[PDB]
Design a protein around this nucleic acid. Structure first.
Lengths: 141, 137, 64, 191, 75, 141, 49
RNA sequence: CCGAUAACGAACGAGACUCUGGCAUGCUAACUAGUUACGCGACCCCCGAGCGGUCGGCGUCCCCCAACUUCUUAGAGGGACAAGUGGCGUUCAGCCACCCGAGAUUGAGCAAUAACAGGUCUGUGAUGCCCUUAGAUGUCCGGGGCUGCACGCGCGCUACACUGACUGGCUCAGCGUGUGCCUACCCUACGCCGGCAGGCGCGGGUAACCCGUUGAACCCCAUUCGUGAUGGGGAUCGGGGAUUGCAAUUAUUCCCCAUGAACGAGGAAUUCCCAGUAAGUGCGGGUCAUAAGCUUGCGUUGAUUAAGUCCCUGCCCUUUGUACACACCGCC
């Protein structure tokens, strides 16, 4: 039951829980006043993205062998009303995906790969998908 | 579920109790949705509630913070008033205050015979878009 | 007077009259009665084999 | 389900086309009761292949209309495999009977075609190939459920599942069965 | 003409009806409470989870968007 | 020696190459079983081959699909077509033919382009119009 | 065949109207009794079904 | 086209052709594709299953003296040809239905005679004549205008919302495009810094290698909202901050704040089109120092309905009338 075998959207639900119920990661200060990406209209409601997004980011690295900040920005996109203008694609915030990577690095979920870009390290490779067992075997539903 | 407030009056401006708390802060001139959560994030008011609830301490907690923002960690994005010019004050203007400031900077531009002022005086576009076809009222 | 509902499909599609090309003229067996033969103008796309419905079984819709 | 080809959860067997004429044009099941209302589709290529497309999916397509929503069949396929799960709660039995014995008595028996008629345009009574009835019926209830569901928050699944019951029964309480009336009514005035 | 302004929070007498009246429907949703009763609809949204205190009403299937929400489960 | 039949089915530009090995055989797209993918309203859509022929019919057949190109929905009649085609080439090449024909019947009595490639592909745009056919509105006095 | 059923009598030939229509050329052409032919054709006076 | 046939047999246009678009487990192959699946030899962490054997699976360790073309690519090929059968048809020319299957039509370019004061002298070092010719209409610097605004029309976009709005998340390309270019100049991977614009670090790239499994939007899925001109909408201005540019005043472009409009489906009209079609939807290209609401391509999501008629508009032939031949927008 790898990250794929678990129905991937109720993965990060529990992986967000993991890193909350650990009580360590390194939550910071641009936090309560963050846009998330110039992309968006409005600061996000669940006051706790980066436990749930570092979840995403970290599992994402599981699926993909290497990923830069430039990559993370790319992936969390959207359309962007410039208003009466047509919608276009704007990269996500770097700062936040970066500090997500650097923070995952603190727990040592991840590491900097060779040839540039972050990938996840064996230790983290665990915490990630350990709970995959726990999410499949939470219950069949 | 407590219907007692039946609307509220805040900061010299009429406000609606029924509307959600983040939304309610929005109405006052000088605010907007952006800054109006951030006030309710530092203040630590639970955002899942209506402006026709809360206590007098909560609503003052809003005003103390929103009227004096920088001191409660609110950075300098969410100051609409950035390097004012009449002293290098950089704070957040609210209420009629902005209408006052607004007018004063129109007055200032006008008084210094400069273009942008003339353009308000006449009633035109300031921002050089073409008014051949739009701006018809 | 007389008010039944009779369903019949003309054995052969015949033409596609009407001003704008609407009505496909049809020769329709009564269905309720084998013997009866009627000519009517239909609006929907028909063919050889398909049942259709007329309010009055008399009008025998003529050249239009 | 290898025993018999059902429909997410649903019986398509024990379903009968309750008025001959529409039979052979309503393709609820040749033997072919499709499970889903998404399908590759190419029933718009030739002319009378259009009927052989299942009345259910044929309704999803007829539902993903209107300017801001064209080609969102993923979307509306919910609505319709979402609507039927309401009907069976109210009526019981296959709500496919409620769909099929809607379209039959949602759509008329005959219609009012416009001839040129010199200048004053006296429409003529003509019967129809089960098509202008079938189709008009189909929007009229789509359009009906649609129009009812701007400014109430009514679920299109709910709003449609009104109409399909209100037209399955000659209930005179929908949008489809309220115009199925008039086209006949206009025709009667003509003759 | 269609103007429909309703109180955000149910009055106690009204709540009893929701406690009372909600048992007397089948095809329920945030709609069917906010049109029959005069509840906002976000507090209906809310009320419908409150009314799962011990499934006074029954969930057929919560679709991401629409709750889709049945009679009590009598027989 | 087991089976090793690879077969592709396409839709638009969604090449989906399935492949059937002999085993226990519980089937998966890229690296995740059929229960997910999660356009989801569809789902039965890609289960169809299973549900038609029998859960028994892949009970000695590990199938692994891979999908690139095309798009969200397309990728599914692509993978549907592939695990019906592949499964067809299975019972043909080494196993039998009668069951190949009982399969090919069970499928092609309702196609949904199961073994038949949809011959269609998109038209090009022509100058003086937003799409292929439609045209920039005519000014006119 | 409506009338041949309802007939009190048996068989029955039914009558015929013998109208001598009789058009001015204007209405003959307008209402498509004759038409308007080629120079060689104008002459060919036969009456051909 | 056949046939009736004072005609018979020919030529240009149509057609044939080219490009294109789709069937080709048929061939030739391909470290500048893919690879594929192996063989799986592994690392390998419980990434996950499993007591453990064993397995499901991304990633890699690859390389390769595997092996191969299953998809990728692009060469040779084949095929599809009203080809079969049943209607209909002067039982010809064909048309219609069905079989096998792409059913005879996937979409452009090319496009005759002959025209038209159509447009173009401002695409042409193509240019007739004419002007003008130093105070120069020769070429420029600086600025300005080409953007100006009581009104009028023309192509666009965004809305009017809850099949939707903003709040989590998952996750599917294609055609291109790129430096290092005729005179000074890109494509960009990955580090820090910053909210962001961006900034500051450093890396590959005559490219199928680097950007780049081009990691998208609708779309899809996760919560708010509750039909309020509201959270739609999102104009007009207040204020900051970046970037391009020697310089943006005449908001350059972008970001960050802040204000926060009309529009709740549009009066008289009228264009667009039939299958992967309309629509939405981004994305490339072109335009570019700076940069597009422009076009031209590209997928992607993908409908409804006509499958016929000449009822309006306009086109073809035939016969006919015609005082029209500047041709009815005529003549009188």
């Amino acid at each position: 039951v790898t990250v794929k075998d678990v129905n991937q959207q109720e993965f990060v639900r529990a992986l967000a829980a993991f890193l909350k119920k650990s009580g360590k990661l390194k939550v910071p200060e641009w936090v309560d006043t963050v846009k998330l990406a110039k992309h968006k209209e409005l600061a996000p409601y669940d006051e706790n993205w980066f436990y749930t997004r570092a979840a995403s980011t970290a599992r994402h690295l599981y699926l993909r062998g290497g990923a830069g900040v430039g990559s993370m920005t790319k992936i969390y996109g959207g359309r962007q009303r410039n208003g009466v203008m047509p919608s276009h694609f704007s990269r996500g915030s770097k700062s936040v995906a970066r500090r997500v990577l650097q923070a995952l690095e603190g727990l040592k979920m991840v590491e900097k790969d060779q040839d540039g870009g972050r990938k996840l390290t064996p230790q983290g490779q665990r915490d990630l998908d350990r709970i995959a067992g726990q999410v499949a075997a939470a219950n069949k539903k | 579920p407590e219907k007692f407030q039946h609307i509220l009056r805040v900061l010299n401006t009429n406000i609606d109790g029924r509307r959600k708390i983040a939304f309610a802060i929005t109405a006052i001139k000088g605010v907007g949705r952006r800054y109006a959560h951030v006030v309710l994030r530092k203040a630590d008011i639970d955002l899942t509630k209506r402006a026709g609830e809360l206590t007098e301490d909560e609503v003052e907690r809003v005003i103390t913070i929103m009227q004096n923002p920088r001191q409660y960690k609110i950075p300098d994005w969410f100051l609409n008033r950035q390097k004012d010019v009449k002293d290098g004050k950089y704070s957040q203007v609210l209420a009629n205050g902005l209408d006052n400031k607004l007018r004063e900077d129109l007055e200032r531009l006008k008084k210094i015979r400069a273009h942008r002022g003339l353009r308000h005086f006449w009633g035109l576009r300031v921002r050089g878009q073409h008014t051949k076809t739009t701006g018809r009222r | 007077r007389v008010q039944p509902i009779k369903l019949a499909r003309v054995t052969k599609v015949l033409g596609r009259t009407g001003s704008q090309g609407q009505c496909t003229q049809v020769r329709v067996e009564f269905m309720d009665d084998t013997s009866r033969s009627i000519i009517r103008n239909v609006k929907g796309p028909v063919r050889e084999g398909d049942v259709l419905t007329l309010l009055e079984s008399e009008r025998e819709a003529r050249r239009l | 389900t290898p025993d018999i080809k059902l429909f997410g959860k649903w019986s398509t067997d024990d379903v009968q086309i309750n008025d001959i004429s529409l039979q052979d044009y309503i393709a609820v099941k040749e033997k072919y009761a499709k499970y889903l209302p998404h399908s590759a589709g190419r029933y718009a290529a030739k002319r009378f292949r259009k009927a052989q497309c299942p009345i259910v999916e044929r309704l999803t397509n007829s539902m993903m209309m209107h300017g801001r929503n064209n080609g969102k069949k993923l979307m509306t396929v919910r609505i319709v495999k979402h609507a039927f799960e309401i009907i069976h709660l109210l009526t019981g039995e296959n709500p496919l009977q409620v769909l099929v014995n809607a379209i039959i008595n949602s759509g008329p028996r005959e219609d009012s075609t416009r001839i040129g008629r010199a200048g004053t345009v006296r429409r003529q009574a003509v019967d129809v190939s089960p098509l202008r009835r079938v189709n008009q019926a189909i929007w009229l209830l789509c359009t009906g459920a649609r129009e009812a569901a701007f400014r109430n928050i009514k679920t299109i699944a709910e709003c449609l599942a009104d109409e399909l019951i209100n037209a399955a029964k000659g209930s005179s309480n929908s949008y489809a069965i309220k115009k199925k009336d008039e086209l006949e009514r206009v025709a009667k005035s003509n003759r | 003409r269609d103007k429909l302004n309703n109180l955000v929070l149910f009055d106690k007498a009204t709540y009893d009806k929701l406690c009372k009246e909600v048992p007397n429907y089948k095809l329920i949703t945030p709609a069917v409470v906010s049109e029959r009763l005069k509840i906002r609809g976000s507090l209906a949204r809310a009320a419908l989870q409150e009314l799962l205190s011990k499934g006074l009403i029954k969930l057929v299937s919560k679709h991401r968007a629409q709750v889709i929400y049945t009679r009590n489960t009598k027989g | 020696p087991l089976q090793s039949v690879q077969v592709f089915g396409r839709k638009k530009t969604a090449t989906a190459v399935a492949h059937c090995k002999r085993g226990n055989g519980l089937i998966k797209v890229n690296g995740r079983p059929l229960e997910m993918i999660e356009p989801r309203t569809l789902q039965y859509k890609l289960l169809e081959p299973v549900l038609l022929l029998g859960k028994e019919r892949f009970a000695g057949v590990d199938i692994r699909v891979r999908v690139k190109g095309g798009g969200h929905v397309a990728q599914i009649y692509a993978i549907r077509q592939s695990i019906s085609k592949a499964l067809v080439a299975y019972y043909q090449k080494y196993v039998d033919e009668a069951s190949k024909k009982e399969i090919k019947d069970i499928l092609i009595q309702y196609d949904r382009t199961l073994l038949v490639a949809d011959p269609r592909r998109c038209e090009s745009k022509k100058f003086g119009g937003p799409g292929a056919r439609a045209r920039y509105q005519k000014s006119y006095r | 065949r409506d009338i041949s059923e309802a007939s009190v009598f048996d068989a029955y030939v039914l009558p015929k109207l013998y109208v001598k229509l009789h058009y001015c050329v204007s209405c003959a052409i307008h209402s498509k009794v004759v038409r308007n032919r080629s120079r060689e054709a104008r002459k060919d006076r036969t009456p051909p079904p």
